[PDB]
Every structure is written in C-alpha cells, then in structure tokens.
Ligand binder design. Structure first.
Ligand SMILES: O=c1c(O)c(-c2ccc(O)c(O)c2)oc2cc(O)cc(O)c12
Length: 246
C-alpha cells in the first residue's frame, strides 16, 4: 500500500496471504485475498494465471507479517483453485479478474474464526456504495511502485470511490474501465494500492456492515495523477461466486 498506515490482521481479519512454493524449496508471496466464508478465500485471477496449479499455493489467515509468524495464524492448502473462465488481460486492464480458492488444513479443517480470523460479507446483487464513499484497501503490496521489496508488515489505507462516469474520462483510463470494474482513489493522488496488493479487499460500509465491495485488480503505476486504482466489482459476480461456492 502506497501511503496509508501499518495495521495488524485484527483490523482486517478476513485478509488472506497467498504464497507460491518454488521448486528449490523457496516460497514467495503471490497475492492477497479475502475470506468470504469459512472454506472460501476470494482473490483475483491474474495472481494465478501463469501458474494455475492449486498444489503450488498456500493460504495463511490471521497473518500480520509477510515472512515471520503471527500468533493466531492458520496455514492452508488449496483444495480448489477456481479462476474465472472469461478472464482476459490487455495492455492494462484485466477483466473478470476474480479468483476463488477453497481452503483446507492438512488436518481437513476450514477457517475457524478468532481474534485474528473472521469472514467478510459479500454485497447484495448490484448493491455498491455511491461515488465519493470512503473505503479500505489492505495488503503487503509495495509502499512505492519503484521498490524491490514488500513490507514485512500488513498495510491499509483509505480511498474514495470514483464514478464510472469520472473513471472513464480519457483523462483517466477512459475506455478500458467496464461496468464490472470499480474505480477508487485518493482525492490528493498520494495513497493507493500497488503491486502485490492484488487480490485484496476494497471494503466499504454497506447496510451498517463491512462489505467486500472490490478486489484489487489493476492501475497505472501506484498512486499517480490522474490514474485511480481499479478493482473487480464484487456485486456483479455473485452468480459466479454463489455458483462456484455452491
Ligand atoms: O495485475 C497486476 C496489477 O493489477 C498491478 C497493479 C497496478 C496498479 C495498481 O494501482 C494496482 O493496485 C495494481 O500490477 C501488476 C504488476 C505486474 O508485474 C503484474 C501484474 O499482473 C500486475
């Protein structure tokens, strides 16, 4: 996360840390996620598109640190790695950029809620907040685009939603933002998600309840005028979510 504060997993207990096993024993971080139900993490498909083998991946819940162990964390195998079928990526945009990982401990158990692990609510069909509403992004993505390292500590920040009418100005991203996407950024252009925050939750207050309003998807750069963060619009994918978690 560019700008914003350091948080811990207790402020974003639904957050999920997805890593990939590499063949010389090494294990790097891949992307973030959100736990939408006990057995189900929801992330973004581009995180997995080059390496689509579920057996490569590990999910951690209740994890505030990127490469050291948080007291509370549970480690998971990926039983199912569902990527969206009609996913496609162009110069910038990524479309239908939404993944689902069913999780299971080597012991068989799913996510058991705790001080540091909780589920997050999905919105109603086509039920987002209005433009200009403040929302929370979270992850281990870079503190500045140009770095070559991720933060060891989990970060969060706040951003305002940007109407599609405003997002689609050629000034911004123009054509490339569909109605299945969602634009959020800071007024001042100084805080945003960045690389490696992908798959992570854009969370807005909806019906007096924290709701997964987006998945971190793409942007040009990290936090630069006048290019907002773009997020997969969760409300428009509930049939796909409900059908594949069925
Ligand atoms: O898929 C990707 C993605 O979405 C982002 C990104 C860009 C701008 C943002 O504002 C943002 O939040 C994320 O960077 C990437 C960098 C890569 O090397 C590969 C990718 O696949 C992505």
């Amino acid at each position: 996360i560019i700008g914003g504060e350091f948080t811990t997993i207790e402020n974003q207990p639904w957050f999920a840390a997805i890593y990939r096993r590499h063949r010389g024993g090494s294990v790097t971080y891949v992307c973030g996620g959100s736990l939408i139900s006990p057995c189900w993490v929801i992330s973004a498909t581009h995180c997995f598109i080059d390496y689509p083998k579920k057996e490569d991946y590990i999910v951690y819940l209740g994890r505030s640190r990127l490469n050291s162990n948080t007291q509370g964390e549970m480690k998971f195998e990926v039983e199912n790695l569902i990527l969206h079928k009609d996913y496609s990526a162009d110069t910038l945009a990524h479309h239908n950029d939404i993944a689902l990982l069913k999780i299971r401990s080597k012991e068989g158990r799913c996510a058991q809620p705790s001080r540091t692990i909780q589920t997050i609510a999905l919105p109603s069909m086509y039920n987002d907040p209005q433009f200009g509403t403040s929302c929370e992004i979270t992850g281990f993505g870079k503190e500045q685009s140009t770095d070559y390292l991720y933060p060891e500590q989990l970060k969060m920040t706040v951003v305002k939603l940007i109407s599609h009418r405003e997002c689609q100005q050629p000034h911004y991203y123009g054509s490339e933002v569909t109605t299945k996407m969602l634009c959020a950024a800071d007024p001042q252009w100084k805080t945003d998600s960045c690389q490696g925050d992908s798959g992570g939750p854009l969370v807005c207050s909806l019906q007096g309840r924290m709701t997964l309003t987006g998945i971190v998807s793409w942007g040009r750069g990290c936090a630069l005028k006048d290019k907002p963060g773009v997020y997969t619009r969760v409300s428009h994918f509930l049939p796909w979510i409900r059908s594949h978690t069925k």
